[PDB]
UniProtKB/Swiss-Prot annotation, chain B:
Residues 206-220 are annotated as: Loop L4. It is found in: Cytoplasm, Cytosol; Nucleus; Secreted, Extracellular space. The chain holds residues 57 to 303 of 303 of the full protein. Thiol protease involved in different programmed cell death processes, such as apoptosis, pyroptosis or granzyme-mediated programmed cell death, by proteolytically cleaving target proteins. Has a marked preference for Asp-Glu-Val-Asp (DEVD) consensus sequences, with some plasticity for alternate non-canonical sequences. Its involvement in the different programmed cell death processes is probably determined by upstream proteases that activate CASP7. It comes from Homo sapiens. Changing S171E: Mimics phosphorylation; leading to inactivate thiol protease activity. Changing D136A: Strongly reduced thiol protease activity. This is Caspase-7.
């Protein structure tokens, strides 16, 4: 009872949204590497015992639909819920195939008052997406809150670039997959994420022929309203 | 290693800004109960080995200039840095007695490229302040390092929302935080402490009121971590 209870026949559902190809309109490039990230994250979360489903090139509306529908499914026998968004991004919103939807709109479906079978259960959103212009230069009888029990792990701090090598995928995802691969079952969620932060920070530096992009850095950003420790075991 | 190094002469500086009174033109009221909070926290933090300084009723320029100076001091002999803001707030912004300033402008002074002596060390911010008007109704090289690394913010509430404070006991967040650093200040990791605070505030507080719009409300704090190691306030081992 300092831990979330994992005594359920399922760990839970994990939805991957892998947005790669974008409608001409949006003016957004192709995200080479995302398929590599998605595969990695499929195996990872499978290892934990998540029932993982991947949906490719979803528009908004579709994104809302998935998340709304799952919000409405029955989670009684599930320990927790997890969704993963891989897309383009700017502050507070993310890209569909056809436009942008704001994150709060996706997640809100799961608020305690809007999804009872997930009440008092962790809800996890992992989000690899740009968050703005910035780039990093570097240096050497009782109730419970409806907003409680969420955790977001963003690829990056608000207002920043998110790096992704076309041939190896996200820095963040490379990191997060390895760490889960090796420690997913014996580290608390905040430990795992702190290691990702550390690994993305130390061992990664961007290179480009453009000096404006050469030798940039990155740090992921974890937002937590969990109320217990979370382990993916016992 | 996996822990932040704690073998320094001092644990570090701990600045507490205690904004209780405000100029009438800001339309902001006396923050009754805030002195309880500052008291409980200067006790807690001193108790951990912080050198704590308590400022009162600051202007926006004072908050800005204060924190700028702190970041320009020499932290070489210090393991970490902590700052605690107790004021009125709105999304993105905390009040001086003067008016309003961007939380983000306050903390930027400590970015890696502007505060070299705190490079690779945890810079902690704790914030008790309304973050919006929404109410929780409830329910039954060799490599460099990024300049935004090693920050942790612990907001007393989630963005967009209200923060509860008792004229009599002080704010829900600070009661809980302070009470938990008593018991487990020295044996729990920082994210463990703060998770327990989340648990405490969620599970064990509910707003009693006459105006049924402010009646039976709930609260959940919000922790944003950029930390890159585990953090305990002791060398031990």
């Amino acid at each position: 009872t300092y831990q979330y209870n994992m005594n359920f026949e399922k760990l839970g559902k994990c939805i991957i949204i892998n947005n790669k190809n974008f409608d001409k309109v949006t003016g957004m490039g192709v995200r080479n590497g995302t398929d590599k990230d998605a595969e990695a994250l499929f195996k990872c979360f499978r290892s934990l015992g998540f029932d993982v489903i991947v949906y490719n090139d979803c528009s908004c509306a579709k994104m809302q639909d998935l998340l709304k529908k799952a919000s409405e499914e029955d989670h009684t026998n599930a320990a927790c819920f997890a969704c993963i968004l891989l897309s383009h991004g700017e502050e507070n919103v993310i890209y569909g195939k056809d436009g942008v939807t704001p994150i709060k709109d996706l997640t809100a479906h799961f608020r305690g008052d809007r999804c009872k079978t997930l009440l008092e259960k962790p809800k996890l959103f992992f989000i690899q997406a740009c968050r703005g212009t910035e780039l990093d230069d570097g240096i050497q009888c009782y109730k419970i809150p409806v907003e409680a029990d969420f955790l977001f792990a963003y690829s990056t701090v608000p207002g920043y670039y998110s790096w992704r090598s076309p041939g190896r995928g996200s820095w963040f995802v490379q990191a997060l997959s390895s760490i889960l691969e090796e420690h997913g079952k014996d580290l608390e969620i905040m430990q795992i994420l702190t290691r990702v932060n550390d690994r993305v920070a130390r061992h990664f530096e961007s290179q480009s022929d453009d000096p404006h992009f050469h030798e940039k850095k990155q740090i992921p950003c974890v937002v937590s309203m969990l109320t217990k420790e979370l382990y993916f075991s016992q």
